[PDB]
Amino acid sequence: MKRTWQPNRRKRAKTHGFRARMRTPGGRKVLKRRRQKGRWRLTPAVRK
Amino acid sequence: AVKKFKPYTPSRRFMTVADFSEITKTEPEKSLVKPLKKTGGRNNQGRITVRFRGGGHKRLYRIIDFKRWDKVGIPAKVAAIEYDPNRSARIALLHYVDGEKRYIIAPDGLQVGQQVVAGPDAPIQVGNALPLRFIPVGTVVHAVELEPKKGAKLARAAGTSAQIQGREGDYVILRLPSGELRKVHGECYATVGAVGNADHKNIVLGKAGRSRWLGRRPHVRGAAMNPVDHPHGGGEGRAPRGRPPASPWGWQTKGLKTRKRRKPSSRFIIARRKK
RNA sequence: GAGCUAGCCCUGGCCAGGGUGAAGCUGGGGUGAGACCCAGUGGAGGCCCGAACCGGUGGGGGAUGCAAACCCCUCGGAUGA
RNA sequence: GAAUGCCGGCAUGAGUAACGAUAAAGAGGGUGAGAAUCCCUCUCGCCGUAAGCCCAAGGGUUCCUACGCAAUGGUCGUCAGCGUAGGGUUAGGCGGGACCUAAGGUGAAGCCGAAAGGCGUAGCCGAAGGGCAGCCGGUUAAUAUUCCGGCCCUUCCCGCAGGUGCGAUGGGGGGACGCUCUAGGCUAGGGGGACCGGAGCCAUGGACGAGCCCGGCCAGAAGCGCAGGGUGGGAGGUAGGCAAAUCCGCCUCCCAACAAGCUCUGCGUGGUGGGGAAGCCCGGGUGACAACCCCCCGAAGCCAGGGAGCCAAGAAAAGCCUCUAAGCACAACCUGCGGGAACCCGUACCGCAAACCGACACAGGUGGGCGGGUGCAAGAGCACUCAGGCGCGCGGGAGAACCCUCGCCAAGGAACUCUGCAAGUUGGCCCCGUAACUUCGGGAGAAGGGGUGCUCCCUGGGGUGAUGAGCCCCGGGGAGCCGCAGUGAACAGGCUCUGGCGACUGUUUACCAAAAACACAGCUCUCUGCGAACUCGUAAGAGGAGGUAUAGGGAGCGACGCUUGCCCGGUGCCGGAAGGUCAAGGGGAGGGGUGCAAGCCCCGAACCGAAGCCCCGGUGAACGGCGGCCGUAACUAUAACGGUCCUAAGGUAGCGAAAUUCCUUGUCGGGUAAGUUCCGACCUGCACGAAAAGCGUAACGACCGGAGCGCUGUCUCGGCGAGGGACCCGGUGAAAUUGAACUGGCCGUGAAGAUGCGGCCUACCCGUGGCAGGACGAAAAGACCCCGUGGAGCUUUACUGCAGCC
RNA sequence: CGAUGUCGGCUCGUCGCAUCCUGGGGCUGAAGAAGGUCCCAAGGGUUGGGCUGUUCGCCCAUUAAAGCGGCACGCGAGCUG
RNA sequence: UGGGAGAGGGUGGUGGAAUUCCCGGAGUAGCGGUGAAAUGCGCAGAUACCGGGAGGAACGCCGAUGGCGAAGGCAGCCACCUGGUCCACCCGUGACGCUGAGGCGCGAAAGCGUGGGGAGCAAACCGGAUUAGAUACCCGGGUAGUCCACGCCCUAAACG
RNA sequence: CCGAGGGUAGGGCCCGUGACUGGGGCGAAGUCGUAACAAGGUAGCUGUACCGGAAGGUGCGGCUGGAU
Ligand SMILES: [K+]
Ligand SMILES: [Mg+2]
Ligand SMILES: [Mg+2]
Ligand SMILES: [Mg+2]
Ligand SMILES: [Mg+2]
Ligand SMILES: [Mg+2]
Ligand SMILES: [Mg+2]
Ligand SMILES: [Mg+2]
Ligand SMILES: [Mg+2]
Ligand SMILES: [Mg+2]
Ligand SMILES: [Mg+2]
Ligand SMILES: [Mg+2]
Ligand SMILES: [Mg+2]
Ligand SMILES: [Mg+2]
Ligand SMILES: [Mg+2]
Ligand SMILES: [Mg+2]
Ligand SMILES: [Mg+2]
Ligand SMILES: [Mg+2]
Ligand SMILES: [Mg+2]
Ligand SMILES: [Mg+2]
Ligand SMILES: [Mg+2]
Ligand SMILES: [Mg+2]
Ligand SMILES: [Mg+2]
Ligand SMILES: [Mg+2]
Ligand SMILES: [Mg+2]
Ligand SMILES: [Mg+2]
Ligand SMILES: [Mg+2]
Ligand SMILES: [Mg+2]
Ligand SMILES: [Mg+2]
Ligand SMILES: [Mg+2]
Ligand SMILES: [Mg+2]
Ligand SMILES: [Mg+2]
Ligand SMILES: [Mg+2]
Ligand SMILES: [Mg+2]
Ligand SMILES: [Mg+2]
Ligand SMILES: [Mg+2]
Ligand SMILES: [Mg+2]
Ligand SMILES: [Mg+2]
Ligand SMILES: [Mg+2]
Ligand SMILES: [Mg+2]
Ligand SMILES: [Mg+2]
Ligand SMILES: [Mg+2]
Ligand SMILES: [Mg+2]
Ligand SMILES: [Mg+2]
Ligand SMILES: [Mg+2]
Ligand SMILES: [Mg+2]
Ligand SMILES: [Mg+2]
Ligand SMILES: [Mg+2]
Ligand SMILES: [Mg+2]
Ligand SMILES: [Mg+2]
Ligand SMILES: [Mg+2]
Ligand SMILES: [Mg+2]
Ligand SMILES: [Mg+2]
Ligand SMILES: [Mg+2]
Ligand SMILES: [Mg+2]
Ligand SMILES: [Mg+2]
Ligand SMILES: [Mg+2]
Ligand SMILES: [Mg+2]
Ligand SMILES: [Mg+2]
Ligand SMILES: [Mg+2]
Ligand SMILES: [Mg+2]
Ligand SMILES: [Mg+2]
Ligand SMILES: [Mg+2]
Ligand SMILES: [Mg+2]
Ligand SMILES: [Mg+2]
Ligand SMILES: [Mg+2]
Ligand SMILES: [Mg+2]
Ligand SMILES: [Mg+2]
Ligand SMILES: [Mg+2]
Ligand SMILES: [Mg+2]
Ligand SMILES: [Mg+2]
Ligand SMILES: [Mg+2]
Ligand SMILES: [Mg+2]
Ligand SMILES: [Mg+2]
Ligand SMILES: [Mg+2]
Ligand SMILES: [Mg+2]
Ligand SMILES: [Mg+2]
Ligand SMILES: [Mg+2]
Ligand SMILES: [Mg+2]
Ligand SMILES: [Mg+2]
Ligand SMILES: [Mg+2]
Ligand SMILES: [Mg+2]
Ligand SMILES: [Mg+2]
Ligand SMILES: [Mg+2]
Ligand SMILES: [Mg+2]
Ligand SMILES: [Mg+2]
Ligand SMILES: [Mg+2]
Ligand SMILES: [Mg+2]
Ligand SMILES: [Mg+2]
Ligand SMILES: [Mg+2]
Ligand SMILES: [Mg+2]
Ligand SMILES: [Mg+2]
Ligand SMILES: [Mg+2]
Ligand SMILES: [Mg+2]
Ligand SMILES: [Mg+2]
Ligand SMILES: [Mg+2]
Ligand SMILES: [Mg+2]
Ligand SMILES: [Mg+2]
Ligand SMILES: [Mg+2]
Ligand SMILES: [Mg+2]
Ligand SMILES: [Mg+2]
Ligand SMILES: [Mg+2]
Ligand SMILES: [Mg+2]
Ligand SMILES: [Mg+2]
Ligand SMILES: [Mg+2]
Ligand SMILES: [Mg+2]
Ligand SMILES: [Mg+2]
Ligand SMILES: [Mg+2]
Ligand SMILES: [Mg+2]
Ligand SMILES: [Mg+2]
Ligand SMILES: [Mg+2]
Ligand SMILES: [Mg+2]
Ligand SMILES: [Mg+2]
Ligand SMILES: [Mg+2]
Ligand SMILES: [Mg+2]
Ligand SMILES: [Mg+2]
Ligand SMILES: [Mg+2]
Ligand SMILES: [Mg+2]
Ligand SMILES: [Mg+2]
Ligand SMILES: [Mg+2]
Ligand SMILES: [Mg+2]
Ligand SMILES: [Mg+2]
Ligand SMILES: [Mg+2]
Ligand SMILES: [Mg+2]
Ligand SMILES: [Mg+2]
Ligand SMILES: [Mg+2]
Ligand SMILES: [Mg+2]
Ligand SMILES: [Mg+2]
Ligand SMILES: [Mg+2]
Ligand SMILES: [Mg+2]
Ligand SMILES: [Mg+2]
Ligand SMILES: [Mg+2]
Ligand SMILES: [Mg+2]
Ligand SMILES: [Mg+2]
Ligand SMILES: [Mg+2]
Ligand SMILES: [Mg+2]
Ligand SMILES: [Mg+2]
Ligand SMILES: [Mg+2]
Ligand SMILES: [Mg+2]
Ligand SMILES: [Mg+2]
Ligand SMILES: [Mg+2]
Ligand SMILES: [Mg+2]
Ligand SMILES: [Mg+2]
Ligand SMILES: [Mg+2]
Ligand SMILES: [Mg+2]
Ligand SMILES: [Mg+2]
Ligand SMILES: [Mg+2]
Ligand SMILES: [Mg+2]
Ligand SMILES: [Mg+2]
Ligand SMILES: [Mg+2]
Ligand SMILES: [Mg+2]
Ligand SMILES: [Mg+2]
Ligand SMILES: [Mg+2]
Ligand SMILES: [Mg+2]
Ligand SMILES: [Mg+2]
Ligand SMILES: [Mg+2]
Ligand SMILES: [Mg+2]
Ligand SMILES: [Mg+2]
Ligand SMILES: [Mg+2]
Ligand SMILES: [Mg+2]
Ligand SMILES: [Mg+2]
Ligand SMILES: [Mg+2]
Ligand SMILES: [Mg+2]
Ligand SMILES: [Mg+2]
Ligand SMILES: [Mg+2]
Ligand SMILES: [Mg+2]
Ligand SMILES: [Mg+2]
Ligand SMILES: [Mg+2]
Ligand SMILES: [Mg+2]
Ligand SMILES: [Mg+2]
Ligand SMILES: [Mg+2]
Ligand SMILES: [Mg+2]
Ligand SMILES: [Mg+2]
Ligand SMILES: [Mg+2]
Ligand SMILES: [Mg+2]
Ligand SMILES: [Mg+2]
Ligand SMILES: [Mg+2]
Ligand SMILES: [Mg+2]
Ligand SMILES: [Mg+2]
Ligand SMILES: [Mg+2]
Ligand SMILES: [Mg+2]
Ligand SMILES: [Mg+2]
Ligand SMILES: [Mg+2]
Ligand SMILES: [Mg+2]
Ligand SMILES: [Mg+2]
Ligand SMILES: [Mg+2]
Ligand SMILES: [Mg+2]
Ligand SMILES: [Mg+2]
Ligand SMILES: [Mg+2]
Ligand SMILES: [Mg+2]
Ligand SMILES: [Mg+2]
Ligand SMILES: [Mg+2]
Ligand SMILES: [Mg+2]
Ligand SMILES: [Mg+2]
Ligand SMILES: [Mg+2]
Ligand SMILES: [Mg+2]
Ligand SMILES: [Mg+2]
Ligand SMILES: [Mg+2]
Ligand SMILES: [Mg+2]
Ligand SMILES: [Mg+2]
Ligand SMILES: [Mg+2]
Ligand SMILES: [Mg+2]
Ligand SMILES: [Mg+2]
Ligand SMILES: [Mg+2]
Ligand SMILES: [Mg+2]
Ligand SMILES: [Mg+2]
Ligand SMILES: [Mg+2]
Ligand SMILES: [Mg+2]
Ligand SMILES: [Mg+2]
Ligand SMILES: [Mg+2]
Ligand SMILES: [Mg+2]
Ligand SMILES: [Mg+2]
Ligand SMILES: [Mg+2]
Ligand SMILES: [Mg+2]
Ligand SMILES: [Mg+2]
Ligand SMILES: [Mg+2]
Ligand SMILES: [Mg+2]
Ligand SMILES: [Mg+2]
Ligand SMILES: [Mg+2]
Ligand SMILES: [Mg+2]
Ligand SMILES: [Mg+2]
Ligand SMILES: [Mg+2]
Ligand SMILES: [Mg+2]
Ligand SMILES: [Mg+2]
Ligand SMILES: [Mg+2]
Ligand SMILES: [Mg+2]
Ligand SMILES: [Mg+2]
Ligand SMILES: [Mg+2]
Ligand SMILES: [Mg+2]
Ligand SMILES: [Mg+2]
Ligand SMILES: [Mg+2]
Ligand SMILES: [Mg+2]
Ligand SMILES: [Mg+2]
Ligand SMILES: [Mg+2]
Ligand SMILES: [Mg+2]
Ligand SMILES: [Mg+2]
Ligand SMILES: [Mg+2]
Ligand SMILES: [Mg+2]
Ligand SMILES: [Mg+2]
Ligand SMILES: [Mg+2]
Ligand SMILES: [Mg+2]
Ligand SMILES: [Mg+2]
Ligand SMILES: [Mg+2]
Ligand SMILES: [Mg+2]
Ligand SMILES: [Mg+2]
Ligand SMILES: [Mg+2]
Ligand SMILES: [Mg+2]
Ligand SMILES: [Mg+2]
Ligand SMILES: [Mg+2]
Ligand SMILES: [Mg+2]
Ligand SMILES: [Mg+2]
Ligand SMILES: [Mg+2]
Ligand SMILES: [Mg+2]
Ligand SMILES: [Mg+2]
Ligand SMILES: [Mg+2]
Ligand SMILES: [Mg+2]
Ligand SMILES: [Mg+2]
Ligand SMILES: [Mg+2]
Ligand SMILES: [Mg+2]
Ligand SMILES: [Mg+2]
Ligand SMILES: [Mg+2]
Ligand SMILES: [Mg+2]
Ligand SMILES: [Mg+2]
Ligand SMILES: [Mg+2]
Ligand SMILES: [Mg+2]
């Protein structure tokens, strides 16, 4: 049947993207936390 | 004069429609329509604040003139009478001799190709608008301002009307469509005559679908829900209300008055409503 | 977290073919005028049959599956909420 | 040494299940160390509203070529969506941006919030919507509306000519709109041709034919022709379109009017440029100077912003046009012509799937366009088949039980069983014919029945065309032919009678419930006078609603028909400016502490003092409730009648062994040979009853009862047959489970159900196909029950708080 | 209670005997026939239907007869539900 | 042709008396009701009186033993639209008439549907008396209805 | 070809019968009340409506076949 992952690049960028994170206090702490942890990528890769 | 259908389907049994006899023009004045934003009963939070709304036909709002004192002494001609999907009443299109065009709500008996006008010296003739202090006591009247220059607020719905019962100082006394007696300031404008389309209430929707066309989504009973949802929720099998009948939010709903007690307008309401 | 799901908003798209034949309209009869009757025209509808599409009624299979809900047969809706 | 411990390793089950749709394969020839599996050929089968072709999303080199086979591929592999390498994506016109707005988002102004932040007008952003200039062919191993060829077009800059009051982010017009039905004329596409072009063919009995087979076009600027859309002209007045205005709007007047004219689009033609089959021979060459014509069918697409009807009344903004304002009228704009200028990103490949979403090359899911032909009434249905694409990445044998899917069956025909579950039967079209009841539509495809193919003859109407031929579309009549059978294959209702429930179409527990549940039109109560009530929010602010009592909220009931009785003592709500009670505060009789004293300080009665509660009333489609005992009639039996106790009042109409009846299979009647079910009645209703509505109701229902007819492998009662498995051989090779095991029966015993203890009996060692009685077999630390001063959801006249409200 | 699946049916049986029938008997208030009661006896047999989920029971038509119990109210790694 | 009387009918208007309710004033201890009472209302200020307001229904006197209509029926006043009828003149048509099965239309009250309206009245219903009982007569309340619009019903001691 | 009739299916009319049910007629001496006839002790009758063990009552309108 129809499963839960239905990829959509605009959706992905506008939801989890860098600019989305930066707009929100909660978003910025996510970036802060992932940098502190040393994540190679702070944000989901999407080809735009 | 409502139109009926033959029983060629189960819903065409009882379904009735307006006759649309008074209508003379079937597509709106383009300079007087602007888009109506359908809300779905949701506020700027995204939240439903009025349950069971949405999914109705698309509509264009028609800008109505509810402050006819705008143009005192300038007569206008009744160009046409049109359908308005945003209200129960019909609307009338006016060609002012000024060149300007406006919509007003159509009073009962208003005929196309007649002059109407607004102001203190206006004739007491169906369609004209005056301050209440210049309208003869006993005259039925609609689209009444509740405060001077604030706009017509009272008696707007199809078939409705207010009657002037007397005067007292700067104020006149009106019997509202509801039966309430109220003082309204003399300077408040109002249009002589009753609103038209009085057969509006005799329309039988006929099926669930006509409700949906009007933007009315299904209404679910408290009794049909669970305790988490509603006071009437739950019960094993059917159940009487089992407590005083209440809204979803707990307040009682058979008889509990809700008009704020210390409201300043109380000084101006002579007698609460009938029936 | 509403890329699943539920509701709403904005903007687009889709519904083979066949059947029934409402109002109205025209003509004819009727009457003081009417109601109304008959025929023709007409093409209404949460109308009918049935693909696409949307479903999931009954049964069988499957049951370390092809599948963490599937397959076959049958069945519901199909201009409408 | 144990924790269903943790990490790792390796066993068992076992050479076992399985190898992923039953659309299907066989041979020959190549390549190579090696071939059922790679390449080629011939044969065979499958898809063909796709299992073919083109977009979009998502994927991200998977594309092409060479060289490879360790792993990946459910087998193999020389092959590959795999490994290594090199190559491959070309745009002013396609899509997006340098244009416009939609919801929504953001947000100068402004509002609000302890902080973080939330709002918010304009503006800005935001698309699969608006707007905007490219079609046909050729070429590469791989790109092409992009390269090339032909013919077209847009914007910007500058210049020239001609014309004009030029000029705007401002005014106005326009853009600009729904649903259903639908006209005329075209085009897409298709069928036919005895006409035109073609390599060839004559078989096996016949045919050298008016024979078979193949094909008979595509694009195109101006002009022209056909068909459409859009659109009145002039003048005078003018206070409105937030300055102005010659524009627009309004009024008057003349002319024009189903037209014309002007303009815009589609189509045809059109200079020119392309294409071009079968077959033969090696993707190419020939065919070929290829021919490129006639008739018919014909869109849902085009003309298009067409027309009609209807109610539920159907985006915006820019481009474009007009008006003017500052300003400037050496300018500036408009038109035509010329040269110049024209940027950024996408472009490979997959794309109903082995490349996307499902851990897999996974029988699942995935939006848009094209989707040919013949026949069946139509069609995207169904059977076959074109182009095109496939035979589904284990095979070979065998011909057992059993399982799955399928075919048939003597006589019987529901006797099966909880149940006709299942499977038969019926089945399309045309014609005849069709009941109770009904809300007059329906019920209705009721029921039942006749026809249905092919041949010859006669004839009727329509479309095209020309009025005719030809072609095509509907028919009527007569005479015959064949078979068991003519919707000869495929797709295609079994029917009726009678109850319960729900009016109806709808809706629901994604993944055990589709229903009698929810919804529903409709009825009633109730709140709400608008800065409405109500709802979300601390707020601002929103929804309500740019609505105004014929409206909006809440509640119950649930089409319609006929109806909805009595009780207001209690609870709720509603009314009652009195009385009672009543907090902070007012008041300060009268006390207390301290000081030498003024004083400073504390307690404090009466009395005044809100809502709330008390008290007085109202109110049932508000929460709710609607009796007991005893007696009485001239046969008996039974009580219309009476007595008395109690209650706020004692169940009214209708219905009743019921979706409700315990006793119960009540009793009687019907149906049956037989009826705990069903149907109709009776009424001692354990324990119906009137909007948690009462009693009915045509129509409707994948709802739940009962009966009959038809027909059946459901059954008596089983038999045979087909294919896919199961079986044997070659290849690959799991799983849960498992203290170790050298693991028999009886009767006992044992923690009470023993392979394991006792006595006896029986038994050579090891397997394979089978069946499921045991191993208190496996799986899940029982979901029932209890226990825990464990948890959580829910309720209320449990406690105590908080929002909110007074 | 770190699970011993719980009614009934179907299928397949097997055992007990306190015997329903068939065989052998004694007593009889046994004339014959047909019965009654008790004894011996488990070899074989012990029907098809209507109703209900039923076991059971009632009922129809038969019969030599239409037996009663055990096997985890025998039997769901056998089926049904 | 010329005249007359009339509550004949339909439509739109409009007048005063009275009942009830509401606000104000003034005022106190009862009012109401009956055969007698009680229920009921009244110190929360009733009844009675004055002023103001809201609304519905019916039209006193004229009024009669009257008039009009085919019947049912029709009563303030005004206007509009309309029916029948009688009298005068003796002018016109020249038997054009009577009746009338079916048909069609009208048809008091009650009652029904959909809206409205609602003062008074009043089935049902409640309460107080009476009574052996009192599902009545009498008293206090009171809902349909009585009123309007449109549409049905079509009955009657529709009687002379 | 027609054709008696036979068969399948569906209708219409009539008769007989049916648990149970509705009222009706009749029947020497049952029970309850007293509605009508007198102003019948509330004048009666009336069409209709609602109510009530029963006769009846009440509303609305109508008749005198109503006493004084
Ligand atoms: K339990
Ligand atoms: Mg889903
Ligand atoms: Mg997942
Ligand atoms: Mg999605
Ligand atoms: Mg996207
Ligand atoms: Mg996208
Ligand atoms: Mg998105
Ligand atoms: Mg989205
Ligand atoms: Mg976001
Ligand atoms: Mg983002
Ligand atoms: Mg922060
Ligand atoms: Mg920060
Ligand atoms: Mg890095
Ligand atoms: Mg992130
Ligand atoms: Mg109707
Ligand atoms: Mg009708
Ligand atoms: Mg109208
Ligand atoms: Mg109209
Ligand atoms: Mg606009
Ligand atoms: Mg809006
Ligand atoms: Mg917003
Ligand atoms: Mg709400
Ligand atoms: Mg809503
Ligand atoms: Mg309107
Ligand atoms: Mg005011
Ligand atoms: Mg209504
Ligand atoms: Mg609407
Ligand atoms: Mg509603
Ligand atoms: Mg509801
Ligand atoms: Mg509930
Ligand atoms: Mg529930
Ligand atoms: Mg919740
Ligand atoms: Mg709660
Ligand atoms: Mg609650
Ligand atoms: Mg409850
Ligand atoms: Mg419940
Ligand atoms: Mg419930
Ligand atoms: Mg219950
Ligand atoms: Mg209830
Ligand atoms: Mg309760
Ligand atoms: Mg409550
Ligand atoms: Mg509140
Ligand atoms: Mg009020
Ligand atoms: Mg989505
Ligand atoms: Mg459809
Ligand atoms: Mg038909
Ligand atoms: Mg027709
Ligand atoms: Mg028409
Ligand atoms: Mg339909
Ligand atoms: Mg299924
Ligand atoms: Mg089946
Ligand atoms: Mg799952
Ligand atoms: Mg499963
Ligand atoms: Mg399936
Ligand atoms: Mg199928
Ligand atoms: Mg079907
Ligand atoms: Mg259908
Ligand atoms: Mg269809
Ligand atoms: Mg639609
Ligand atoms: Mg240990
Ligand atoms: Mg552990
Ligand atoms: Mg571990
Ligand atoms: Mg491990
Ligand atoms: Mg290791
Ligand atoms: Mg290992
Ligand atoms: Mg091994
Ligand atoms: Mg094994
Ligand atoms: Mg396996
Ligand atoms: Mg498999
Ligand atoms: Mg298949
Ligand atoms: Mg196939
Ligand atoms: Mg071969
Ligand atoms: Mg082969
Ligand atoms: Mg090989
Ligand atoms: Mg090999
Ligand atoms: Mg090959
Ligand atoms: Mg060969
Ligand atoms: Mg095809
Ligand atoms: Mg398709
Ligand atoms: Mg991937
Ligand atoms: Mg390999
Ligand atoms: Mg290999
Ligand atoms: Mg290698
Ligand atoms: Mg591998
Ligand atoms: Mg695989
Ligand atoms: Mg090799
Ligand atoms: Mg490439
Ligand atoms: Mg180009
Ligand atoms: Mg630039
Ligand atoms: Mg804060
Ligand atoms: Mg954006
Ligand atoms: Mg766009
Ligand atoms: Mg649009
Ligand atoms: Mg473009
Ligand atoms: Mg072009
Ligand atoms: Mg350009
Ligand atoms: Mg401009
Ligand atoms: Mg428009
Ligand atoms: Mg518009
Ligand atoms: Mg429509
Ligand atoms: Mg063309
Ligand atoms: Mg064709
Ligand atoms: Mg010929
Ligand atoms: Mg050919
Ligand atoms: Mg051309
Ligand atoms: Mg001007
Ligand atoms: Mg000019
Ligand atoms: Mg050549
Ligand atoms: Mg289309
Ligand atoms: Mg168009
Ligand atoms: Mg149009
Ligand atoms: Mg906008
Ligand atoms: Mg100059
Ligand atoms: Mg110009
Ligand atoms: Mg640039
Ligand atoms: Mg490309
Ligand atoms: Mg593709
Ligand atoms: Mg698919
Ligand atoms: Mg597709
Ligand atoms: Mg592929
Ligand atoms: Mg999966
Ligand atoms: Mg595969
Ligand atoms: Mg073809
Ligand atoms: Mg067909
Ligand atoms: Mg295969
Ligand atoms: Mg396949
Ligand atoms: Mg094999
Ligand atoms: Mg074998
Ligand atoms: Mg198969
Ligand atoms: Mg055979
Ligand atoms: Mg047979
Ligand atoms: Mg049979
Ligand atoms: Mg038979
Ligand atoms: Mg049966
Ligand atoms: Mg059986
Ligand atoms: Mg069943
Ligand atoms: Mg068939
Ligand atoms: Mg019939
Ligand atoms: Mg019948
Ligand atoms: Mg019926
Ligand atoms: Mg009928
Ligand atoms: Mg049909
Ligand atoms: Mg024939
Ligand atoms: Mg033949
Ligand atoms: Mg020819
Ligand atoms: Mg069918
Ligand atoms: Mg029948
Ligand atoms: Mg239901
Ligand atoms: Mg239903
Ligand atoms: Mg019902
Ligand atoms: Mg019903
Ligand atoms: Mg309903
Ligand atoms: Mg319903
Ligand atoms: Mg439907
Ligand atoms: Mg479910
Ligand atoms: Mg669930
Ligand atoms: Mg569930
Ligand atoms: Mg679920
Ligand atoms: Mg689930
Ligand atoms: Mg299921
Ligand atoms: Mg259910
Ligand atoms: Mg269903
Ligand atoms: Mg539900
Ligand atoms: Mg419901
Ligand atoms: Mg109702
Ligand atoms: Mg109400
Ligand atoms: Mg809140
Ligand atoms: Mg608004
Ligand atoms: Mg009826
Ligand atoms: Mg009745
Ligand atoms: Mg009470
Ligand atoms: Mg009370
Ligand atoms: Mg109370
Ligand atoms: Mg001292
Ligand atoms: Mg109570
Ligand atoms: Mg209770
Ligand atoms: Mg009662
Ligand atoms: Mg009653
Ligand atoms: Mg009973
Ligand atoms: Mg019974
Ligand atoms: Mg019942
Ligand atoms: Mg029940
Ligand atoms: Mg009961
Ligand atoms: Mg019991
Ligand atoms: Mg019982
Ligand atoms: Mg029972
Ligand atoms: Mg019985
Ligand atoms: Mg009986
Ligand atoms: Mg019987
Ligand atoms: Mg009894
Ligand atoms: Mg109930
Ligand atoms: Mg029914
Ligand atoms: Mg029915
Ligand atoms: Mg249904
Ligand atoms: Mg159903
Ligand atoms: Mg049966
Ligand atoms: Mg069988
Ligand atoms: Mg076989
Ligand atoms: Mg062997
Ligand atoms: Mg091997
Ligand atoms: Mg392998
Ligand atoms: Mg051991
Ligand atoms: Mg051992
Ligand atoms: Mg052993
Ligand atoms: Mg052994
Ligand atoms: Mg023991
Ligand atoms: Mg033992
Ligand atoms: Mg042993
Ligand atoms: Mg041992
Ligand atoms: Mg031993
Ligand atoms: Mg020992
Ligand atoms: Mg032994
Ligand atoms: Mg073996
Ligand atoms: Mg074995
Ligand atoms: Mg076993
Ligand atoms: Mg077993
Ligand atoms: Mg164990
Ligand atoms: Mg076991
Ligand atoms: Mg076992
Ligand atoms: Mg499990
Ligand atoms: Mg645990
Ligand atoms: Mg446990
Ligand atoms: Mg557990
Ligand atoms: Mg326990
Ligand atoms: Mg405790
Ligand atoms: Mg404890
Ligand atoms: Mg606890
Ligand atoms: Mg829980
Ligand atoms: Mg808790
Ligand atoms: Mg246990
Ligand atoms: Mg365990
Ligand atoms: Mg276990
Ligand atoms: Mg013997
Ligand atoms: Mg024996
Ligand atoms: Mg038992
Ligand atoms: Mg048993
Ligand atoms: Mg029993
Ligand atoms: Mg014998
Ligand atoms: Mg036994
Ligand atoms: Mg036992
Ligand atoms: Mg037991
Ligand atoms: Mg057992
Ligand atoms: Mg089982
Ligand atoms: Mg069992
Ligand atoms: Mg087991
Ligand atoms: Mg076992
Ligand atoms: Mg069950
Ligand atoms: Mg007093
Ligand atoms: Mg006092
Ligand atoms: Mg009033
Ligand atoms: Mg008088
Ligand atoms: Mg004369
Ligand atoms: Mg009448
Ligand atoms: Mg009343
Ligand atoms: Mg009524
Ligand atoms: Mg008289
Ligand atoms: Mg015969
Ligand atoms: Mg007949
Ligand atoms: Mg009688
Ligand atoms: Mg007697
Ligand atoms: Mg008497
Ligand atoms: Mg008396
Ligand atoms: Mg009397
Ligand atoms: Mg009584
Ligand atoms: Mg009475």
Swiss-Prot record, chain A:
GO terms for cellular component: ribonucleoprotein complex; ribosome. InterPro entries: Ribosomal_bL34 (IPR000271), Ribosomal_bL34_CS (IPR020939). One of its GO terms (biological process) is translation. Keywords: Ribonucleoprotein, Ribosomal protein. Residues 26-48 are annotated as: Disordered. GO terms for molecular function: structural constituent of ribosome. It holds the Pfam family Ribosomal_L34. PROSITE patterns: RIBOSOMAL_L34. Residues 29-48 have a biased composition (Basic residues). The keyword Methyltransferase does not apply. The keyword Repeat does not apply. Found on the solvent side of the large subunit. Belongs to the bacterial ribosomal protein bL34 family. The open reading frame (ORF) for this protein is entirely within the ORF for the RNase P protein (RnaP). The two start codons are separated by four nucleotides. Part of the 50S ribosomal subunit. This is Large ribosomal subunit protein bL34. The lineage of its organism: Bacteria, Thermotogati, Deinococcota, Deinococci, Thermales. The gene is rpmH.
Curated annotation (Swiss-Prot), chain B:
One of its GO terms (cellular component) is large ribosomal subunit. PROSITE patterns: RIBOSOMAL_L2. InterPro entries: NA-bd_OB-fold, Rib_uL2_dom2, Ribosomal_uL2, Ribosomal_uL2_bac/org-type, Ribosomal_uL2_C, Ribosomal_uL2_CS, Ribosomal_uL2_dom3, Ribosomal_uL2_RNA-bd_dom. SUPFAM superfamilies: Nucleic acid-binding proteins, Translation proteins SH3-like domain. Disulfide bonds: none annotated. GO terms for molecular function: rRNA binding; structural constituent of ribosome; transferase activity. Residues 229-239 have a biased composition (Basic and acidic residues). GO terms for biological process: cytoplasmic translation. Residues 222-275 are annotated as: Disordered. It comes from the Bacteria. Residues 256-275 have a biased composition (Basic residues). Keywords: Ribonucleoprotein, Ribosomal protein, RNA-binding, rRNA-binding. It holds the Pfam family Ribosomal_L2_C. The keyword Ribonucleoprotein applies. One of the primary rRNA binding proteins. Required for association of the 30S and 50S subunits to form the 70S ribosome, for tRNA binding and peptide bond formation. It has been suggested to have peptidyltransferase activity; this is somewhat controversial. Makes several contacts with the 16S rRNA (forming bridge B7b) in the 70S ribosome. Belongs to the universal ribosomal protein uL2 family. Part of the 50S ribosomal subunit. Forms a bridge to the 30S subunit in the 70S ribosome, contacting the 16S rRNA. May also make transient contacts with protein S6 during translation in the 70S ribosome. This is Large ribosomal subunit protein uL2. The gene is rplB.
